[PDB]
Chains A and B, each alone.
Chain A
Amino acid sequence: VTSFGFGQKGAQAVVVHPDYLFAVLDRSTYEEYATKVSARNKKTYRYM
């Protein structure tokens, strides 16, 4: 993601996929993580 601005203002982001974060953490942490996401998804569903 590159953005060029006035006043010699260039920029660049790089946006890596989430699955390369979800392989630095072990089996216990991920399957505990996926529950609270499925909990928050239904709770944000009701709010939205």
Chain B
Amino acid sequence: MFWKELDDTIFNLPKNKLLDALNKKRDHIIKKLNNDFQKPWFGKNANGVCDLQEMTYKEVANRLVELMYVKKSHRWIDVSLRNMY
């Protein structure tokens, strides 16, 4: 349902209104990428959601282990994501 909300509003726009609509809809999009959608927002500093450039390198790396390594089954999602980390 969140896929459809971005289809009627953001994704049908042309290129000139695309970057402006994402700026005004930003913290609302970040709200349901974390809550509703399967691909989360990557930025997470001091348990606060954030932008990417306000994260340290260690919490950038530990968030890559959080979102690409399955700790319950001790395996990666992909080898090519292991070759990304």
Which secondary structure dominates chain B's binding surface?
A: helix
- Interface size for A (C-beta < 8 A) is 3
Contact with A along B38-64 (1 / 0, CB 8 A): 000000000000000110000000000
Contact with B along A26-45 (1 / 0, CB 8 A): 00000000000000001100
Once bound together, how far apart are the Cα atoms of A42 and B54, in whole Å? 8
List of B residues within 8 angstroms of A9 by Cβ:
none
Least Cβ–Cβ distance between A16 and chain B, in angstroms: 34
Least Cβ–Cβ distance between B22 and chain A, in angstroms: 20
Closest B residue to A46 using CB positions: B53
Q: Which residues of B contact A (CB under 8 A)?
A: 53-54
